[model samples]
Each structure stands twice: as structure tokens, then as C-alpha cells.
Target: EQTIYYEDYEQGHVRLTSGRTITETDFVVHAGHTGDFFPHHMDAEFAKTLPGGQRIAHGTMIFSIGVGLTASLINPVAFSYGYDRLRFVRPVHIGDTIRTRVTIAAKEDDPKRPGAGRVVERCEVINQRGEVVLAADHILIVERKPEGTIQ
Candidate 1:
């Protein structure tokens, strides 16, 4: 995959990612690895009594997936400054296919920081039902490598 430089992005440009499915193993592995043994994500029987009537993926899992989708589709970002306006709008069940879309919302050349640009991007993670499970605005500092710097 080619690296995406600061110059490649423009405000309003959008990129959609390929889909990935959430599975039981995904939840179990993440829970075990992170030690987040919340019953809703680890114990199906216990989760069945919840309002959703079934175990659901951890919110962190969905957040991770959304960020992964963004990274897979768009790479070589210099640095992720921060995220804002984050929201989890719906539950993500096991076996649900999810994808992400990112829109470049704003951009600014950083005069004080040579060879750098700041960008504000909005990302949405949608499930198979076309429901947006997660959305956030991410701020990034993108580097514009100086000519002849690497070689």
C-alpha cells in the first residue's frame, strides 16, 4: 500500500473501506487479552438477560475496529493528534459485518510547523444493517517530507 501524504487529502474527499465481520472469537480474544471480562462481552448466558438479549461486542472493540478500518484504508498519516465528537450509536453483534467511511472535513497548512499540515476527518462505522455504530472526528498532523530528505 502506498503512503498517503499530506498533499493527497482535500476537504470533503471521502474514502470507504472494505467490510470486516465481528465474530465470537474476536470478542473472546480481545476480552482475554485486555482483561476486560465484562459479562456482556464474555458471558453469553449472563448477557442474555440484558436488554439486547445477547452478548455484544465491547464498545472498545467497535472503536478499535473503526480505527483499524480507517488505518487499513488510509495510511502513512504522520500522527493522530486526537479525536472528538465520538459516539456509539448502535450495538454491534457477533457476525455483524462492519465497514468505515472517512471524509476530510477540514485542512489547514501549519505555517509555524514546517512541512506539516493539519486535517480534521470525520469517520463513520456502519454495520450490515446500514446503521452507524460509531462516528468520530479525528484530528491529524500530516507530514510533508522535505524533498531529498530520505535519499
Candidate 2:
């Protein structure tokens, strides 16, 4: 894996991932895996009774896809800390093409761990129309440069 020290993260650095089109199999598989076969996601006829007139994709599944899309690059010196302020801002449906935008939002020292830093990134999942469907903050605990490393 590549190594990127905490100091390498810059605020406002942005990455836009390639698009992924949601499919019926995505709903079926996600529902089966999560045991979330509610009519809202599984029953198309039942879904028609709702305001959106279609099966709504599971927010969690979309969240997973959103974060997964950002996994193209790996940094050995950094690990996921946690996520915060997660929200399903809009509904996603089958055939909705989505992409993830990740931006380095902030950086700070890790209070509980010496020689490490916290890098916070804003993640947004947007659909074909550029409407954000999901949003969250992903935090990574990244190692600081080794003391003896070249400045």
C-alpha cells in the first residue's frame, strides 16, 4: 500500500469518483444481505403507493457505495477513524447513476494518540442530476511523519 503521512492531507483537496449506476440487483442483493426486505424497497407494487412511486434504495447501501467508491486509493499510514453527520439527503432509485465527491475538510492533532493526526473529509453521494443523495464526514487517523524522516 502507498504511504501518505498526515501532513500530506490538505484542506479543500477534492476527488470526484467515476459514476456507478444503481441496479435492481443492487436493491435485491442489499436487501437480502441486510434482511431489509421491507415493501418500500422490495415490493414494487407497494412502492407505487408511496409519494415517489418507486422502490427507494436503502440509504445504508448507498452510503456503502459512496464510501466504497473512494477506496480506489489506499494509504498504509492512515486508517479509518469513524463517520459523522451521516444523512440521506435525497432518495435514490434504480437506474440512478451516482458518484462520490470527497474533499479534505479539516485536519487536527489526535488528542488521544500521540504522533498521529485526524483528517476529516466531507463525502457526498450525488446522482445524475447532481443532487446529493447522501452526505457524511469520514475521519481518518493518519500517522505523522517519523521523527527521523527528512524534513
Candidate 3:
């Protein structure tokens, strides 16, 4: 709905989104949707034998909610490219509150698209304890501003 051209992005730019607590419903619906009912996630008893002593939330769900927090704004001039270097740094337990910190890490020309560029944003998902649980690079293809515009 809004226009944010590629030129508007700058390296090292950072922003943080509000925190949202992950609930049992998130685990249930996420598992149901993905069919990833691994014992580590579903079996609390089995999880107690593991390091965390609790059922761990699915990594993919954490990823979805993590990146999902950044969609508060819509930029019509930009489209998702893809993700890269995705990693689950820590286990996300149910009821753990998470927040996303997005940094404009880098930008480069989109060779195949003459009027667009690629913007790489480093997305960090942190828990209530200030530990980073997930990290990924969110790439966006953004249109360039029209030439000769004072904007």
C-alpha cells in the first residue's frame, strides 16, 4: 500500500517489532499444519530426558512467527525475494515470548531486473531472556525510484 523504493534502504539500519508470546495453540496448529509431530516437540516426557526438560516448539513455527512480526507495514514497491543462512540458534519453548529485530544488512543491484535492487535484511528472533533463537536473511526486491525526482 505504501512505496518504499530500494534507494530508501541503508546498510546498518535497524528496527524492532513488538513481542508476542508463543502459546500451546501455536504449537498445536503449527504441528497440525506442517505434520511435524516429532517426539521432541510432542512428547513432554521424552523431552524431559533431553537437555531442556520440556517440549520444544517447532523450528519452522518459530521462523514463521519471527518473520511474521515484521509485516506490520506494507511496501508495495518491494517483493519478497527469499531467505538465506537460516539457523535455529536455540530451542524455543512454549509460552516463550519472542521479538524480531531487523537490520538492513546490505543492498545490491538485481542484475536481471534493471529497475530493481536486492535488499538483504538480517532478522534476529530473540526470546524474553534476550537470547537469539532464530536468525535469517530476508531478501527483498525493491523497485528503484523514478529518475529526476526530488524525493
Candidate 4:
């Protein structure tokens, strides 16, 4: 799919979609990759001791899901400038269905940087129980033209 470029974005535009469920394998792979072998995410027997009485998805896992859900919709961005005001408000357990929504919070033309512009996208990730698992505002520079195009 052709990604929406910086020039193409308009403030207030919004996109909403759901992501695939969080599976045990997802946690296993993520934990292994990050070397975060926390019992809450890996050892079910140990996890049962927690208040939830079940293995909980890693916070980064939820963040990754939010990124994945957003990326699946708006990809091929020039570069992610940074993120701001990130908050993890709820827990996501294994087998929970995840979803996300993106809104064009703001947009601005970059005068100092030729052929580039900025977009602030607000993203929210929610789990099946209607709780917000993660939320963030991503500031990014999106392509104004294909590579090598002069401003």
C-alpha cells in the first residue's frame, strides 16, 4: 500500500482498526528477543502468584502491538522523529485481542529542512475489555517525494 506522505496528511484525519490477538508465542518471542525473562511474562506458575493470577503481556509487547497496528495502516514513513507523553494505562494478558486508532493531531511544514515536513500522530491501543493498554504521540517526518526528488 502507498503510505500517506507528510504533504498528504490533514489535521483531524483519523484511522481506526483492530490488531490480531496476543498469543503465548508472541510473548515468548518478545521476551526472548529483549532478554526480559520476567516471571510475569514467562513462568505461568510464578505468574499465578500475581494479583491477576495469569501471565501478563509485557508492557513493551503492548507498545509494540500499538506500533504494529499503526504501522500496518500508515507505513513507509520518512523517519520517526520521536515520541512524546507515552503512557501505559492498563495491562494486556495473553489471548487478549488488541486494536488501535490513529488521528492526525497536527501537521507542519518544515521550512528549515527542505523537502521534508512534520506530522504528529496520536495513537491509542486498546485491549478486548475496552481498556486502554497504551497511548502515545508520535512525531515523524514523512516523505514529500520519492527518494532523490528535489524540493
Question: Which ranges of candidate 1 are over 4 A from the true structure?
Answer: 111-114, 145-151
Report the alpha-carbon TM-score of model 1 versus the true structure: 0.85
Cα lDDT of model 4 overall?
0.83
Best by TM-score: 2
Worst 10-residue lDDT window, candidate 2: 142-151
After superposition on all C-alphas, the RMSD of every candidate to the true structure, in Å, is 3.5, 1.6, 2.1, 3.4
lDDT of each residue in 2-97, candidate 1, tens digit only: 667788787799888889999888898889878898887788899989989989777878888788977755456568889998997998989999
Model 2: colliding residue pairs:
none
Residue 135 C-alpha lDDT in model 4: 91
Better of 2 and 4 by lDDT: 2
In candidate 1 the C-alpha lDDT for residue 72 amounts to 51
Q: By lDDT, who's the top model here?
A: 2
**How big is the positional error of residue 12 in model 3, measured in Å on the Cα after superposition?**
1.4
- TM-score, each model? 0.85, 0.95, 0.93, 0.82
Question: After superposition, which runs of candidate 2 have C-alpha atoms over 4 Å from their true positions?
Answer: 149-151
Residue 53 shift from truth in candidate 4, angstroms:
2.3
Q: Write the residue-wise lDDT of candidate 4 on 10-89 in tens digits.
A: 89988888567999899989998899987878999998899889987888888887788766564575688899989988
Q: Is candidate 1 or candidate 4 better by TM-score?
A: 1
lDDT (10s digit) by residue, model 2, range 1-151 = 7888988888899999999999999999899899999999899999999999999899999999899898888888888979999998998989999999999999998789888999999999999999999999999999998867567
> Is 2 or 3 the stronger prediction by TM-score?
2
